[PDB]
Amino acid sequence: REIVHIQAGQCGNQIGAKFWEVISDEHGIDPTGSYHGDSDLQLERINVYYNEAAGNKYVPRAILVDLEPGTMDSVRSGPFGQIFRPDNFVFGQSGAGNNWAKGHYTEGAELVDSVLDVVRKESESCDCLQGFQLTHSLGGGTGSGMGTLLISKIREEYPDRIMNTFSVVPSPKVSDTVVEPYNATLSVHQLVENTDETYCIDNEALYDICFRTLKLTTPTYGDLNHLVSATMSGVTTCLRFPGQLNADLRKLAVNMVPFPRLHFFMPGFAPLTSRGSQQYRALTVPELTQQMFDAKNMMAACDPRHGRYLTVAAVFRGRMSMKEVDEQMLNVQNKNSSYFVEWIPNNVKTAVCDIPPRGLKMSATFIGNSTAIQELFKRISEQFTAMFRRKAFLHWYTGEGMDEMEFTEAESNMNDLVSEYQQYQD
Amino acid sequence: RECISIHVGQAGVQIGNACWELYCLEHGIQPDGHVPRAVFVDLEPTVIDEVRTGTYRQLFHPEQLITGKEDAANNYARGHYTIGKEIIDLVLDRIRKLADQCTGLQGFSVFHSFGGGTGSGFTSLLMERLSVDYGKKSKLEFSIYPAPQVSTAVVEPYNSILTTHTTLEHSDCAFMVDNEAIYDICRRNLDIERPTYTNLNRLIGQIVSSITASLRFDGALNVDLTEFQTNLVPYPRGHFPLATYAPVISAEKAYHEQLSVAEITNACFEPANQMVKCDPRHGKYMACCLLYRGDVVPKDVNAAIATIKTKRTIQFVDWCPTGFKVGINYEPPTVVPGGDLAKVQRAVCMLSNTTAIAEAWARLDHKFDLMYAKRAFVHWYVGEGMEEGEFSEAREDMAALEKDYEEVGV
Amino acid sequence: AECSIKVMCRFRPLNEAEILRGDKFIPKFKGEETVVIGQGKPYVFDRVLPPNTTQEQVYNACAKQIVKDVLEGYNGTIFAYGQTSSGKTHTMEGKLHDPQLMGIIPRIAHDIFDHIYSMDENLEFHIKVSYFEIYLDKIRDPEEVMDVIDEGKANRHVAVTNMNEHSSRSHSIFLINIKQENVETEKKLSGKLYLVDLAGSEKKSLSALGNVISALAEGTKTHVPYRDSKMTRILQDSLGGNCRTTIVICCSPSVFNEAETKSTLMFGQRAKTIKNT
């Protein structure tokens, strides 16, 4: 049942604010308020993300790890910012340098113990813990570093409970940072070896999907974040709801990972229509699979159409026919037999909740494991070498107590990770 | 004389609430009358709660409603072994406390849903613990086998190759109904592209009612649970017959309802009506246990069947002569006050080992492989309660159910 | 050269219990290359060594020529595949009292050097060993060689499967990298000599073992540091995809194991051709 989110770095943090902004409303929890829940079902399973103390104060059970005060001091000084128990804030007032050796070895390493402390206060909350949700970006000093540490510790403390990771892998076209592949390659490394379910969401893949699939002309970050947080809610929290056929982290993992690498997915939301007009309601269902399974609409950068799938998990959440669901999935599996890897009569783990996204009639989160994500770690891995070769901004790492063999390690590891994934595309 | 019935798994419970409804409905015993004669098991409270919150609320004793607040888990292992274990004792206790109170009973009933967690696993050991505590009775289990193409759970087969092998030696005669080949029934014989899982359950929830419920109920040609396995399995392999129902007509659309026996019986062998793929040609090879219920004249049967025995395109049984166990009950069948089931005054829940499934079985087995193809959705059961064993070893199981239904005929 | 993977078959003798519980020597040897199990299919191998062939004997039959090629500048692998307590560690390193893959390890050390010592002053030889253990789990890193083997063995996991002595828990791999360079001419030569002792082949540590074999069956990552880099990987050149490789499948004669033995006799048989990629 229980769950413990982890906001590593600024990004992973910024997103925390959006993941919790959402989720709460999808659970009727006002800032410090309690359960105003329009219904009574948005409560029997909350535990997964909160804790009982007062009686109106169900506090999010997440961790906020970061070596840059200003950040958490923006998330804690704004809207829902005053719901996290201060104990949750594991800051590192140090210099949150943009190096993959600052928020993981020098500055973050200190703030860690004051985090694990809480991650235990929340885990030992009550009932039975399932796993922890982790949001962050693999392109910054804390985050890919400090958040990637938070897990390496979590996975030593409860190698039983699961670990879903929501990573904002460095978008292609333009990088919102410079060392990006440094902070990234270094964090993916930690991921491929601790968390056991990762949902990679691209930034520019979002813009696109947010500027053409939502005529939205000024897609602020808040938005992107908001869209992402929309998917991670469909995944976890959702399945912790009833359903004709419900699953749960485990079900998504034991049905999505054919080979231990850990493999990375690419989340996709269902009703993604522009506000007014578009409100076509063409959501009978063929419309959702129409959506989810198209190229654009995959939070990832790469396009599915560029590589088979190993597994797929349409985690729908809104009253529908186990027939029009189970059925559609099929044609889909046959119209595209081409790309869907050898097991046609399958490769589509159908999941079905009941209650939908608060204000919507019918939605369906998509979690695709398309060997396609090979063509992303490739990207990342490339950027590294092209700059590692010249040790570009390496002094900001080493000078922070790092190793010339550390970077080697990660790249290789994550680089091999690319290799393996191909072992199935063939 | 009397029986009990154990509705296991959310489904077996939904179907249970249904079969249990039709009952009072044709016995003049409203909401609050006598006292049932069964129990309800599930490792997910919210579902048995539906019997505790919804209709037919006070017609049960909070004692014949077993729940394990814990976790269901769509995996046999966790249900059979690990979790499901904890409850079993308690479960049994009722089927030993309810089995005592009566007067010379005839058998148990298992209403379960083959491919579930609480339905596959649990029962597996429930029927298991029964075959030993009352080997001297009938164990007719009314199942709702995996839809031939429209399954739900990702693992389903793991859970159904495992409930078959463990229950086989305890009694088989496990009716087996798969919406996949049936669900089509809801689209070809009832018309509705809106079939909620709550429907396929109402259906098996029907075919099953024909197994235990009514059969353990007096009639003009009673058939005990033992009867099944005896008249239904030619060989020790926990042989898997297929469940089929006849008047699966829509309670809205068409209305020819008054479809004398001569019709409803022929409607069983056409492959498009057997809750299991659907394509075994006319009927096609078997031991069949034609359980009828409602107003039926034994000659009507001992004629309607005669006509069949000579259709040849329905090519039957081997070494032994005659494979038609005619089971006649009195009380006609029931229907969810307002679901979508016609509501006739006679039906035929025929379940054999060959018939169209027969093909159905294979068309459902093949499915499995494709996915298992390399463990497939195994990681979904392991973390819940299962090994490469239960899957692979329940596959081999049915394999000899494809050979069985083949040998006993053709 | 397009040469095939050689496969020798060594059967250990009936142990305490088996010879206690009675049991009978189920295999039947005909000629120096075929073995039969009852009325079944007569398996033919590059060589079949009954319980009796001495360890020295088991050597000349397998390892001997391998040592000769690694010095000619070729790479050679030798690995013992078998159902725990079938003889792997007995043949790969072990004590003296049985068939082939006798003392593969120690016997190879001597042969290697006895050859070098006998060559002219020029062409210096550079041998360096690597002794590593258990890939499924956490991988753990003539006299000069024996001192190391002794050090290595010490550290190796200890296992047990059937009235045998110390029964493995890892795939221990002992690598010998023989380098050669003619000082006059200056023309070098080298070759890696993998001597692997595989873990049990028998069917929660058993779900872990089925998961490890399944994963390896479809190929494993290509890493060089962590998890990737282990069992079914070290004695890789000892099975398929390879160099001058030679596998010694070990088998129990007791019928109590008839099955597994048949599973083993099948691996070797299939490996024989070894259609490496």
Ligand SMILES: Nc1nc2c(ncn2[C@@H]2O[C@H](COP(=O)(O)CP(=O)(O)OP(=O)(O)O)[C@@H](O)[C@H]2O)c(=O)[nH]1
């Ligand atoms: N979709 C979104 N991506 C973001 C957001 N904020 C940052 N980012 C992205 O994340 C990376 C930069 O990271 P952060 O703000 O998370 C860095 P973090 O604060 O974790 O650590 P520091 O190095 O201590 O600042 C980069 O790819 C930005 O482009 C956001 O709000 N939404």
Ligand SMILES: Nc1nc2c(ncn2[C@@H]2O[C@H](COP(=O)(O)OP(=O)(O)OP(=O)(O)O)[C@@H](O)[C@H]2O)c(=O)[nH]1
């Ligand atoms: N004819 C018909 N078949 C149905 C209906 N609903 C479901 N089915 C069949 O049942 C299968 C779905 O089973 P699930 O509900 O996933 O599993 P279950 O049988 O409930 O057992 P659990 O796994 O324990 O939930 C599909 O393959 C369908 O073919 C229905 O309303 N009508």
Ligand SMILES: [Mg+2]
């Ligand atoms: Mg920051």
Ligand SMILES: [Mg+2]
């Ligand atoms: Mg169900």
